[PDB]
Design a protein around this nucleic acid. Structure first.
Ligand SMILES: *OP(=O)(O)OC[C@H]1O[C@@H](n2cnc3c(N)ncnc32)[C@H](O)[C@@H]1O
Ligand SMILES: [Zn+2]
Length: 586
DNA sequence: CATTCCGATAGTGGGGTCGCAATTGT
DNA sequence: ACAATTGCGACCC
DNA sequence: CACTATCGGAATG
């Protein structure tokens, strides 16, 4: 309610104060994640009132600004994923889905783009002025990388054409072309520097640098592919049309973007790009096919993790060979026992591969895999290690059978492989230390209670030393007790207590998900949350009423019902609430 | 309607690099 | 008593 | 980030 001038000055005062403490204490940086935040808030208010900007304002920073801790930025519009298709048939299925859905909106035109291989970045432009830039994070909240993005030559600090909207969030890929990647490695080996493994991870590392001066020396570039929040302007209903407009604003846009009228045209485009792939000058992992019309785009809507109007049409992945040195079994929070191949380290498409999931016992039999076997490996989708097949012809004289454990490798309990099901799991329950660990690990994960600083190691030790038994115990911990832990310390322990405290404020959906109810993942957690609104109506629901919730049948209904039916869980929840955990009432 | 098909999730798995701070070295 | 290493978790794909 | 099993619900005969 306080006037503009009074708001500007209160932001500048806090900013100039942080800079003061920085110099005084002779600090290495500004440990306050609230310095980058305040700065973007000042920029947002300033671009809004270009006449209320002073030459003394921190926004007119004359030279290198003081280093500051990374802050976060919320995405009004989610930065989701893409459903993948790997072959012409997979695409035709996608095409059928889009068609069968739409009601005689017949004219479906496909906008086709290269799927660049770097990292996603969202850039907010207010009245044509670049105010902030953020990564994707969990889709809702991402890291503020404004300082690093400002050093990217290809990204204009201000747009220029006509009808520039009041608010325009530009989404695209930041990346290192091959020549830039090689230039950086040539410099690393010349000096004592460390060389990067590939351009994707090098580009990402560059944007996580605390000191922008270092980022400025990385020849990062950018390409627009979409839009986030949009307010004002006169943008067209065609996706291509919009990119064409961005290009006119001065934003960088790939000249390869094309329009296809049929599925055959899309396929032709796919093979065309596959052929010129080596002449691009940068890496790609495929092409993105999307409904060009923003209207139809809205009719198709999104699913949990991705739009229904687009797919990433990926290229086949580069294969390599190596051998299995061993197969280990890891226990998950729901008791699941997953086999993992330990491989002889081999380089594949830019990275060192040492491990690959084997999924389950059926997969191991399908492959006929034995310890010692030679295998064909590949980074599926150009990211994840996958064991394609065993090379029988080269099976060593001496190989060892892979024996699925009949007793959990942790608590020793019996393993259960239910009739007709493929998954085998540990039956120890609360007795199993691996389940306890994985469960607490899941409770603390980014899409759950999001407790920064709590990882596999700290959790392992807390469960090992019997300090924690249930989620509630996590908040009873004090700096004193944490300080005396392996790889733990005074400030380190304080950061955890702080993160735990901050984690108290959540949402019903995240809390529900954090509880780890069988078959209740993030999507179902949100559905149940939105349906009942309160933890009361939920645990008071019957199996028959639970089945009224969309996408919830008897399996889920029963698991949910049996979960709250247990006093055990009732007190875990009640204790968490007692501990302080809470969320916005509907 | 009984089966089969399929869209959408759940659950569990991988590697690179950087900042912070625990830990080791001068 | 700082300075240089390096374990761990964040957080990219 | 990818894969597979599984669940819920739509499609098939
Ligand atoms: O499945 P996923 O999470 O890897 O995919 C989402 C990411 O795909 C990238 N990308 C690259 N090119 C495009 C185009 N042209 N359109 C939409 N997305 C694109 C993004 O970086 C995104 O996060
Ligand atoms: Zn066990």
């Amino acid at each position: 309610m306080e006037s503009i001038e009074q708001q500007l000055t209160e932001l500048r005062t806090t900013l100039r104060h942080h800079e003061y403490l920085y110099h005084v204490m002779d600090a290495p940086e500004i440990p306050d994640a609230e310095y980058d935040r305040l700065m973007r808030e000042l920029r947002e208010l300033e671009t809004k009132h270009p006449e209320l900007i002073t030459p003394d304002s921190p926004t007119q920073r004359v030279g290198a600004a003081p280093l500051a801790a990374f802050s976060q930025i919320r995405h009004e519009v989610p930065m989701l994923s893409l459903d993948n298709v790997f072959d012409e048939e997979s695409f035709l299925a996608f095409n059928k889905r889009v068609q069968d859905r739409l009601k005689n909106n017949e004219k479906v035109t496909w906008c086709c783009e290269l799927k660049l291989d770097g990292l996603a970045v969202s850039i907010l432009y207010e009245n044509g002025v670049l105010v902030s830039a953020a990564t994707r994070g969990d889709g809702t909240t991402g890291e503020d990388i404004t300082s690093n993005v400002r050093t990217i030559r290809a990204i204009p600090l201000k747009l220029h054409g006509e009808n520039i909207p009041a608010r325009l969030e530009v989404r695209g890929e930041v990346f290192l072309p091959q020549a830039g990647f090689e230039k950086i490695n040539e410099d690393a080996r010349r000096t004592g520097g460390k060389v990067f493994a590939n351009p994707r991870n090098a580009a990402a590392g560059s944007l996580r640098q605390l000191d922008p001066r270092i980022t400025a020396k990385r020849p990062l570039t950018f390409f627009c592919y979409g839009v986030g929040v949009l307010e004002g302007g006169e943008l067209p209903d065609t996706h291509l049309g919009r990119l064409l407009q961005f290009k006119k604003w001065g934003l960088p846009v790939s000249d390869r973007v094309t329009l296809c009228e049929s599925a055959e045209e899309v396929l032709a485009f796919y093979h065309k790009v596959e052929e010129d792939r080596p002449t691009l000058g940068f890496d790609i992992d495929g092409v993105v096919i999307k409904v060009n019309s923003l209207a139809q785009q809205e009719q198709l809507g999104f699913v949990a993790r991705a739009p229904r109007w687009a797919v990433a049409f990926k290229f086949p992945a580069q294969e390599q060979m190596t051998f299995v040195r061993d197969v280990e079994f890891q226990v998950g929070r729901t008791g699941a026992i997953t086999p993992v191949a330990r491989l002889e380290p081999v380089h594949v498409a830019g990275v060192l591969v040492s491990n690959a999931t084997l999924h389950n016992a059926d997969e191991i039999e399908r492959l006929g895999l034995r310890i010692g076997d030679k295998v064909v490996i590949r980074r599926a989708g150009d990211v994840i290690p996958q064991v394609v097949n065993v090379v029988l012809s080269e099976r060593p004289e001496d190989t060892r059978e892979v024996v699925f454990p009949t007793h959990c490798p942790v608590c020793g309990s019996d393993v259960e492989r239910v009739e007709g099901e493929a998954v085998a799991r540990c039956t120890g329950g609360l007795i199993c230390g691996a389940q306890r660990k994985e469960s607490l690990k899941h409770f603390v994960s980014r899409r759950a209670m999001d407790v920064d600083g709590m990882g596999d190691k700290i959790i392992d030790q807390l469960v090992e030393k019997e300090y924690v038994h249930t989620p509630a115990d996590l908040f009873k911990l004090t700096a004193g007790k944490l300080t005396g832990l392996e790889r733990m310390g005074p400030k380190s322990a304080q950061n955890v207590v702080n993160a735990l405290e901050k984690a108290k404020e959540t949402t019903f959906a995240r809390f529900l998900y954090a509880l780890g109810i069988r078959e209740v993942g993030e999507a179902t957690a949100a559905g149940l949350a939105a349906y009942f609104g309160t933890l009361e109506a939920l645990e008071a629901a019957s199996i028959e009423e639970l089945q009224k919730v969309p996408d919830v049948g008897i399996v889920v209904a029963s698991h949910v019902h049996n979960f709250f039916a247990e006093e055990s869980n009732r007190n875990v929840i009640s204790e968490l609430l007692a501990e302080g955990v809470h969320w916005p009432a509907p």
